[PDB]
Design an enzyme around this catalytic site. Sequence first.
Site, mmCIF file in Angstrom:
data_model
loop_
_atom_site.group_PDB
_atom_site.id
_atom_site.type_symbol
_atom_site.label_atom_id
_atom_site.label_comp_id
_atom_site.label_asym_id
_atom_site.label_seq_id
_atom_site.Cartn_x
_atom_site.Cartn_y
_atom_site.Cartn_z
ATOM 1 N N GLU A 171 3.455 -7.458 7.534
ATOM 2 C CA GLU A 171 2.149 -7.999 7.148
ATOM 3 C C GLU A 171 2.261 -9.054 6.052
ATOM 4 O O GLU A 171 1.490 -9.057 5.089
ATOM 5 C CB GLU A 171 1.197 -6.875 6.721
ATOM 6 C CG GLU A 171 0.887 -5.848 7.829
ATOM 7 C CD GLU A 171 -0.231 -4.887 7.444
ATOM 8 O OE1 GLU A 171 -0.467 -4.681 6.230
ATOM 9 O OE2 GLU A 171 -0.881 -4.340 8.360
ATOM 10 N N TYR A 212 -10.881 -0.747 9.595
ATOM 11 C CA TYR A 212 -11.084 -1.744 8.543
ATOM 12 C C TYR A 212 -12.139 -2.774 8.925
ATOM 13 O O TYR A 212 -12.744 -3.390 8.038
ATOM 14 C CB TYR A 212 -9.771 -2.465 8.209
ATOM 15 C CG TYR A 212 -8.804 -1.615 7.412
ATOM 16 C CD1 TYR A 212 -9.172 -1.073 6.183
ATOM 17 C CD2 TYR A 212 -7.525 -1.351 7.891
ATOM 18 C CE1 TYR A 212 -8.285 -0.274 5.453
ATOM 19 C CE2 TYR A 212 -6.639 -0.569 7.172
ATOM 20 C CZ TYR A 212 -7.022 -0.034 5.958
ATOM 21 O OH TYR A 212 -6.133 0.738 5.243
ATOM 22 N N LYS A 248 -3.842 8.543 6.317
ATOM 23 C CA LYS A 248 -3.685 8.285 7.741
ATOM 24 C C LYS A 248 -2.553 9.093 8.377
ATOM 25 O O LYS A 248 -2.248 8.874 9.554
ATOM 26 C CB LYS A 248 -3.446 6.791 7.966
ATOM 27 C CG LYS A 248 -4.635 5.928 7.551
ATOM 28 C CD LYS A 248 -4.680 4.616 8.315
ATOM 29 C CE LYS A 248 -5.881 3.775 7.880
ATOM 30 N NZ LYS A 248 -5.938 3.626 6.387
ATOM 31 N N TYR A 308 -6.383 -2.225 13.507
ATOM 32 C CA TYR A 308 -7.215 -1.187 12.896
ATOM 33 C C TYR A 308 -8.681 -1.374 13.278
ATOM 34 O O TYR A 308 -9.584 -1.133 12.475
ATOM 35 C CB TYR A 308 -7.037 -1.194 11.378
ATOM 36 C CG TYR A 308 -5.692 -0.610 10.951
ATOM 37 C CD1 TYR A 308 -5.507 0.772 10.885
ATOM 38 C CD2 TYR A 308 -4.615 -1.434 10.652
ATOM 39 C CE1 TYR A 308 -4.279 1.328 10.507
ATOM 40 C CE2 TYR A 308 -3.382 -0.903 10.276
ATOM 41 C CZ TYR A 308 -3.220 0.482 10.220
ATOM 42 O OH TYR A 308 -2.008 1.019 9.845
ATOM 43 N N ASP A 310 0.827 -1.203 0.000
ATOM 44 C CA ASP A 310 0.000 0.000 0.000
ATOM 45 C C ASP A 310 0.865 1.257 0.000
ATOM 46 O O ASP A 310 0.800 2.094 0.898
ATOM 47 C CB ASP A 310 -0.938 -0.021 1.202
ATOM 48 C CG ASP A 310 -1.874 1.172 1.239
ATOM 49 O OD1 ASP A 310 -2.467 1.508 0.187
ATOM 50 O OD2 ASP A 310 -2.009 1.776 2.323
ATOM 51 N N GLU A 317 1.270 -0.351 14.388
ATOM 52 C CA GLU A 317 0.453 0.485 13.518
ATOM 53 C C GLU A 317 -0.952 0.563 14.084
ATOM 54 O O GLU A 317 -1.491 -0.434 14.569
ATOM 55 C CB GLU A 317 0.344 -0.054 12.091
ATOM 56 C CG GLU A 317 1.581 0.057 11.236
ATOM 57 C CD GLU A 317 1.318 -0.340 9.790
ATOM 58 O OE1 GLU A 317 0.138 -0.273 9.356
ATOM 59 O OE2 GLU A 317 2.289 -0.710 9.087
ATOM 60 N N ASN A 349 -0.025 -4.781 14.052
ATOM 61 C CA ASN A 349 -0.804 -3.720 13.429
ATOM 62 C C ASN A 349 -2.277 -4.000 13.685
ATOM 63 O O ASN A 349 -2.759 -5.087 13.360
ATOM 64 C CB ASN A 349 -0.565 -3.681 11.915
ATOM 65 C CG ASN A 349 0.889 -3.365 11.543
ATOM 66 O OD1 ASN A 349 1.709 -3.028 12.399
ATOM 67 N ND2 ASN A 349 1.198 -3.460 10.248
#
Lengths: 578, 578
Positions: free
Chosen positions: B396, B453, B549, B449, B155, B485, B447
């Site tokens: 990841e 997400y 972000k 979210y 990404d 993250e 990480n």
Amino acid sequence: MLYPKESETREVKDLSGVWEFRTESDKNYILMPVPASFNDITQDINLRDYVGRVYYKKSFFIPVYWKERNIFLRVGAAAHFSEVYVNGNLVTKHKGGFLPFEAEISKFVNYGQENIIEIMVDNTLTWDVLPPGELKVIEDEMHPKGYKVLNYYFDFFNYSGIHRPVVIYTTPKVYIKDFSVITELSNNSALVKYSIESEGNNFQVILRDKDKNIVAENFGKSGVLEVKNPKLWEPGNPYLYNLEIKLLEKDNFDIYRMDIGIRTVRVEGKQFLINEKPFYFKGFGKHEDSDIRGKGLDQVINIKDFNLLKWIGANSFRTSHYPYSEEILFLADQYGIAVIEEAPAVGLNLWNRNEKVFTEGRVDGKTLEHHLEIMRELIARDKNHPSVIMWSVANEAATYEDGAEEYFRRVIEETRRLDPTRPITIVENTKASETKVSKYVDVICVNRYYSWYTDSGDLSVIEYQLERDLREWYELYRKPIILSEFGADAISGFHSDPPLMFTEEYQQEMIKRFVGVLDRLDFVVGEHIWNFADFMTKQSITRVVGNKKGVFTRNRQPKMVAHFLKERWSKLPDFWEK
Amino acid sequence: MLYPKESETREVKDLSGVWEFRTESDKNYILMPVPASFNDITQDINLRDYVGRVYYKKSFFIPVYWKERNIFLRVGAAAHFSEVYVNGNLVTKHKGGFLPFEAEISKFVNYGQENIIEIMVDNTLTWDVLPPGELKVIEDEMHPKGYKVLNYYFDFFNYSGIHRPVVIYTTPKVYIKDFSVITELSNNSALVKYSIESEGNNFQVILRDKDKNIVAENFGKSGVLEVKNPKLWEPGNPYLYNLEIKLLEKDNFDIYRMDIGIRTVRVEGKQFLINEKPFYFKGFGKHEDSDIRGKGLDQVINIKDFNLLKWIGANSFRTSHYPYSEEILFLADQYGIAVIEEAPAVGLNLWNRNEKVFTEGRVDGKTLEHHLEIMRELIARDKNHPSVIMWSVANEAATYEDGAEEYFRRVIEETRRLDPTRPITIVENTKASETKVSKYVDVICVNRYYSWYTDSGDLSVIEYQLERDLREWYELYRKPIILSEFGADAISGFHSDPPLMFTEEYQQEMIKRFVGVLDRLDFVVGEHIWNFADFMTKQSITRVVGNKKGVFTRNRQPKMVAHFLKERWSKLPDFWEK
Ligand SMILES: [Cl-]
Ligand SMILES: [Cl-]
């Protein structure tokens, strides 16, 4: 002084990078990139708004083999007063923040060893530097002891620091110091006439075309090079020949090369002629300004800007309001963009007819002396660039004052004496019938902001006011006229219908109505929108984090009116007999 | 290979500046700045999205006095495959877009004359380069003949070009090729242990403090330097000593200097110890990304970024997701910022458990071979920076796959063999109970979210989900944990109450609730928000002109949550026994 260029006989060492940096009477250093303005690099508001002396420091090593060479230390630009020390020795001082300065330093270096360069830069303005300003003490009921302000009346931020590269370069002891080139058209040929400045006297000069073919040669310190079937330089066809100068003496050998362009420029009647064809300027007033680095040179931004100029269909810009880096002029040579290069005589105006500017205490004989030296330095630097096609001696000075007439007569007279090969202008916002100065230039440049600074918001007055005004300029002076500035602040993303001040719509409609007027006037030879891009200014309730009249945002992306201009200018020829 | 540095015995010539540039099988050049990504420089959309080979070209002059010196040509970085030609001669090839490469070129140069360097760069991704991708042909009912796409699953945008400086430097024929430094604490002293790589054998090594005082010396190609009363390097106290290495032989003399820092790093239990004190990471995942130049090195942006790190109170960052320029690590050394430096093993995941990644056809033995060579190149480059305190082997990856276990066991084993002096991590978004790889590292980086997400918009789930998850990581692996993250996209100027996704409020509330959980967990030793700043990505309906972000905008100005973090981190000590 010639731009530092490597050759078979010359080395160049770029000292740009990370330097140590401190402010006056402080012993602790921070890190500071060079070239860059120092104001936006840190989060220290007291450095952002600092007024006074700052000090840059860096170590460098000189190779033992540079002995018996000349060693030159060049500073591209430092705003506004500067002193350069090599191992504690003052090697030169300079006044003026937009032109380069250099000294020969072989007497002060440690060969094969570490050396220390220190550069002091002072951003304190005075009335005898250009652009002018004044430090004022404000110790009244609402200000504590020691409160001071730097006042200045030009509309761009007083960024300071080392704005262009610091480099060290070598030459042989007898070397090419300078040269002058003038191009003429003769029958079906072009002539490149040249003179070289040097203590040497035996020279071979060669001219090569784009494919490295030799098309002309001459032995002589002065002479003429004949080019049969020349390809001329112009906007839309930026053909460059490479001029090679070789000094060949007993003990010294030196080579310097420069790309040059073959073109003529001439004003006749209401026409601005390039290569004997009627030009029409399509372009911008720019600024040396970008995010974070302030006025610092950045070749990424420069190449981006020229690609945008070609994308939108511009063929020209003005270096509002000071000489730009040499790098930008070499690029304008490559891209075929015509440049009006302007001296830093901006801010010579207290928007108020009760405060006189051209008077003892403000703009006086000392200022004039500096202005004349500036014109000499500027023409000496840029005289050989094909892209420079006109000199601007000032922007929006108080030319209605009696004292402005004698001041600018002398500036204009000296500029023409230094360079009879390019026309001269001055950029005016004075009323046509009031300026005592425009009658002395070759081309009239007028800034007009109808419906923005006057009758704010009323777009309906534009056609009435602008046509009447421009016809009066032509009736009084009978010269070609460039509308050298017009525009409106627009916040990106502010939209309205009907259009309102500060919206993208208002900016586009204002610009559209202005140029509709120009199309009806056969004596108008140019349109320059203010500005190419959003740029920083000092803080005031009239500036929404800087000047927002850019056609592009500060990060070089288009507003709505950029697309209007692309469509208009794609339909307008570069050469247009109106 | 050592960073090119001038000394009494070494010259450095920087070839950065304006180069000529063309694409494959095209004869016409344009201008292109170096270093820079080429994608955003022009207005040619077909170059922005170009996939294939591009060619850079530049002239340079070699001084006759460089004869009988080694002449090295160094390319800081070129993404992703590169070939370097000197006067048409291939001098080196390189695979991997984020580490430097060089060759000795004295055999191919014209001394005292013009030379031509050409650099080919290919941005075509494959499954055996890192980061991986694949060029796919799409010739179906809705695509014309020859339609192709470069697919990739990391990404950040696949910017290409020469991203770090190209330089030429000299050394003597017998010279300091490399050296290794390790620092230890012993009684009330520190030891700096060193080994030098060279064909020479007689060395004097000197260590100097901040004031140039000599504090230690040794004669020997290997040895130990004792520093009595050392000042240790750490976040909040970045003390650097200068190590000087002098080769003294009969015919050869060479000096290389580097600032080093004295510190230890060790993981014990649930503590991350720097200089035997419990550290707490406060910081960011960053990216090498800025306006217009893409991934190109810019020291203005770098110094700005470090001043912002100090302003907001951060003490660390991760080089997501690739090695950064050496310049950034030298700055982290100066500023006292702890760096987790990460290999470019990002994108090893097809967000879909039906498509396996660690399998024949994708990530296989060829990819592993490249990854192992990358770790060797990365540690060889950065082993002597005090600021690097941990290696990250991937970000990841699909670590739930059986094939990922053998792959990463080998990567981790080789990394530890190459550098036993720093802990190792891998950055995970796999579920705690599913990863087959985290059991092999020293520190867990996860990480998360939640409410972005998953359960998008529902901030109420954060405390429930995050506390349960992090307790399961600790229960399974009993290692210190960094929340590596977490964050939310926020458009600058988008505001709402109640908070909505993409507003500044939602970003701040999400981050605030995450760190409230971390404060209750004594095994969490760090918080890294994603991301330091807005950065570009490939285009998709999930990316609002890139990844939004950032805590700072792309032009390095703070969003609302930047001020929340400044206030929190001003209250959190760098060393904190939780
Ligand atoms: Cl304005
Ligand atoms: Cl993300």
